[PDB]
Amino acid sequence: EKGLKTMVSLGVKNPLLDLTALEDKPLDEGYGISSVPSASNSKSIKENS
């Protein structure tokens, strides 16, 4: 799954699975009103599992 998401890609992505819809998600790289989404800190044992 991580190879399909990171290394490998998909196939059925034209009008369906539109790039613009993906662009709308994830907000922006710069600081946002609710940037706190993916935290580089806070890696536990049970939560990671």
Binding site: T20, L22, K25, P26, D28, G30, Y31, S38, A39
Partner: protein, 734 residues
């Protein structure tokens, strides 16, 4: 069906409604008899958008003498496109009935993510970087340098739109985002700036909330348009949450370090441009002394960043103080940055009012109030002056400057709360600074001042009376819509009784109680064994869903749920949720049972609308209760006690029930649909919490269904589905 709606004929679009549509006419009969806002509640059964448009077109047809433009406002971009195409269906019906001449410029409008063409801007995925490269390729000064040379960068789209495109209005065509992009491809234009230029000529414009309620975006619908405009919000539960998201500002230590790097970069830029040029700085000092920074503001299309975050009526018209020389203004921002950085150093949670922060400023770093109001105007004029290109690099300092404006403008309604540490931030310094607001009314204030009659429609009839009180709001109509049915179409049950006769609750406040989670898993197992076409299971918090699906594994439950249906658990990745949703919708198409369990706060249940067969049984786990509240909640509740008159335990129950019935209240997308919607804990039976679910769900909540067991609820689900899978044809509805 040819309705008389007291002035006008209305051709019901397709020709299918319940008798509640006749009741629907009476509800807005009050709404437009007297103009003055008005809050409606049609549940999700009738055409939400279709219902909100047939009767308003009937009034404007009967007496369309006081309405220039409709501004629809739906939040998600698919809804923008969906509401435009339902309006386009209704115009196609309207022109099938009449003839060919149906002048009507329908128009969507979102952003440069969704209306930009250029194949070097387009592969960027983020909004600020698209804005930065669009600020690179066109501006007020790069456009002029291209205008007197040849090889300098330009879009060829905005230049060709500048060549001819600002004299031909778009002829009567209802445009989506895709159709508008295609017309931008066709003649060769920017459909973004075409849409913004063609706001002036439209009749229905459908954009988002933050494009209307933000004071620093919505500078594009003027006063004279607004004096005869009808604005219609749609799906308007979290209007107060949109306002508090729209005027609060968060500062972080990373933001201040990148602000320091920004300050050094702009210092070097001032030095090298002092080595380069002097004459436009003379013109800067002129247009500060002479005017009020409006000299080159006439030709300002892509030279506009986010404007001043004060509202439209609290801005000034004076001259910006001691600020004028850009060297001294860099010293000014240097002082303000170092004081806010020193203020953030405090290692305990500190709440202040903004005049206390202004006095701490004006005593300990000598910055007074009016040069701290004009900091936004100054940084926008300076950053226009020094020809600098990629403004995404200058996102923190503008933030800081805009923060300055709010601290120097508003008081007694807002609150500066400093947190040295948050929740999920172990062994990591993360001191942040919420300039948080808690007046909901101060953001829709100019929306009620300018506009004629604003209306909000909710598919869930959330307890409403409270909304008017919060929003400084006095409507004409508070009309309630009732689900008229020839078939039960839904049954809500309150399974608040375990199979061991254990009281199902979430009183423990996310610190696990074992037997209650056991009875939740037993409910999900047996409801899996009964229900077909998938099951949606909303929990309380992601920590609580985390902990529950943890203790459904060590305890031997979750393999049995696997044996009946296929789980798709949620995560807070933006892409993993979309893959889990796609496999959840593929499993239903495979025919194998699926079951999506999520959190009742996040984006999983915001955009999503219940499918005819995508969610049959919306399982609301828990009562929308959190466990990571700092003091924005305590402070907004102290405010609603003090200066409004709304209790603590009243507002908490109101907020929890609007989220719970929001995530469980769009089930009847089409009148002819059967939808199980269970509430799983005992608290939904306690009178005040049940009393704030909408009327069209309390009508079908039977006292026997109130506090069912797991297995009694499973047998009610079986009898529900068997009585409601038979041929319920159109002849049973007339």
């Amino acid at each position: 069906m040819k309705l008389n709606v007291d002035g006008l004929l209305v051709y019901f679009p397709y020709d299918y409604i319940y008798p509640e549509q006749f009741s629907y006419m009476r509800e807005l009969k009050r709404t437009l008899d007297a103009k003055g806002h008005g809050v409606l509640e049609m549940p999700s059964g009738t055409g939400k958008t279709v219902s909100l448009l047939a009767l308003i077109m009937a009034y404007q047809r009967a007496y369309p003498l006081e309405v220039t433009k409709l501004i629809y406002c739906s939040r998600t971009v698919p809804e923008i496109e969906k509401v435009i195409e339902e309006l386009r269906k209704l115009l196609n019906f309207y022109e099938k009935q009449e003839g060919e001449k149906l002048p009507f410029l329908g128009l969507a409008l979102s952003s440069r993510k969704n209306l930009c063409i250029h194949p070097e801007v387009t592969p960027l995925r983020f909004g600020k970087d698209v804005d930065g490269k669009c600020h690179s390729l066109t501006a007020s000064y790069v456009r002029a340098q291209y205008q007197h040379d040849t090889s300098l960068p330009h879009c060829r789209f905005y230049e060709e739109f500048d060549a001819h495109g600002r004299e031909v209005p778009l002829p009567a065509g209802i445009y989506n985002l895709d159709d508008l992009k295609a017309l931008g491809r066709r003649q060769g234009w920017c459909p973004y700036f075409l849409a913004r230029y063609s706001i002036l000529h439209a009749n229905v414009v459908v954009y988002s909330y933050h494009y209307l309620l933000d004071p620093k975006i919505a500078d594009l619908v003027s006063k004279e348009l607004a004096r005869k405009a009808v604005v219609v919000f749609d799906e308007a539960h979290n209007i107060d949450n949109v306002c508090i998201d729209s005027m609060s500002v968060n500062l972080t230590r990373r933001t201040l370090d990148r602000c320091q790097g920004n300050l050094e970069t702009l210092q070097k830029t001032v030095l090298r441009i002092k080595e380069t040029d002097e004459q436009r700085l003379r013109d800067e000092y002129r247009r500060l002394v002479e005017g009020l920074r409006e000299a080159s503001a006439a030709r300002e299309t892509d030279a506009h960043l986010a404007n001043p975050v004060l509202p439209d009526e609290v801005l000034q018209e004076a001259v910006p103080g001691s600020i004028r020389t850009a060297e001294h203004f860099l010293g000014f921002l240097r002082r303000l940055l170092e004081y806010v950085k020193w203020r953030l150093r405090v290692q305990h949670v500190v709440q202040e009012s903004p005049p206390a922060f202004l006095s701490g400023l004006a005593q300990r770093v000598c910055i007074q109030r009016k040069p701290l109001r004009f900091c936004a105007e100054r940084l926008r004029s300076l950053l226009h002056t020094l020809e600098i290109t990629d403004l995404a690099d200058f996102s923190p300092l503008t933030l800081l400057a805009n923060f300055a404006t709010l601290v120097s403008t508003y008081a007694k309604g807002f609150t500066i709360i400093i947190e040295p540490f948050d929740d999920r931030t172990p062994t990591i310094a993360n001191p942040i600074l919420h300039f948080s607001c808690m007046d909901a009314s101060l953001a829709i204030k100019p929306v009620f001042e300018r506009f004629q009659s604003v209306i909000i429609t909710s598919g869930t009839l959330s307890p409403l009376d409270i909304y008017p009180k919060i929003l400084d709001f006095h409507p004409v109509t508070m009309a309630t819509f009732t689900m008229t049915l020839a078939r039960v179409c839904l049954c809500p049950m309150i399974i608040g009784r375990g199979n061991d006769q254990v009281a199902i609750s979430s009183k423990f406040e996310t610190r696990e109680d074992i037997a209650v989670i056991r009875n939740y898993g037993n409910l999900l197992l047996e409801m899996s064994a009964v229900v077909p076409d998938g099951i949606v299971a909303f929990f309380t918090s992601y920590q609580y869903m985390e902990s529950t699906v943890a203790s459904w594994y060590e305890q031997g439950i979750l393999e049995n749920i696997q044996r009946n249906k296929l789980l798709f658990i949620e995560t807070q990745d933006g892409a993993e949720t979309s893959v889990a949703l796609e496999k959840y919708q593929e499993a239903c198409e495979n025919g194998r049972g699926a079951i999506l369990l999520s959190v009742a706060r996040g984006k999983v249940s915001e955009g999503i609308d219940f499918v005819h067969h995508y969610g049959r049984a919306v399982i609301m786990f828990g009562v929308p209760y959190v466990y990571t509240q700092s003091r924005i909640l305590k402070a907004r509740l102290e405010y609603l006690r003090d200066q409004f008159q709304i209790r603590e335990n009243d507002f908490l129950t109101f907020d929890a029930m609007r989220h719970a019935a929001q995530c469980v209240g769009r089930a009847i997308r089409g009148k002819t649909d059967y939808g199980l919607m269970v509430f799983a804990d005992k608290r939904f039976a306690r009178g005040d919490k049940r009393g704030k679910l909408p009327r069209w769900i309390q009508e079908h909540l039977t006292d026997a269904n109130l506090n069912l067991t797991v297995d009694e609820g499973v047998q009610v689900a079986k009898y529900f589905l068997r009585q409601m899978a038979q041929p319920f044809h159109r002849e049973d509805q007339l």
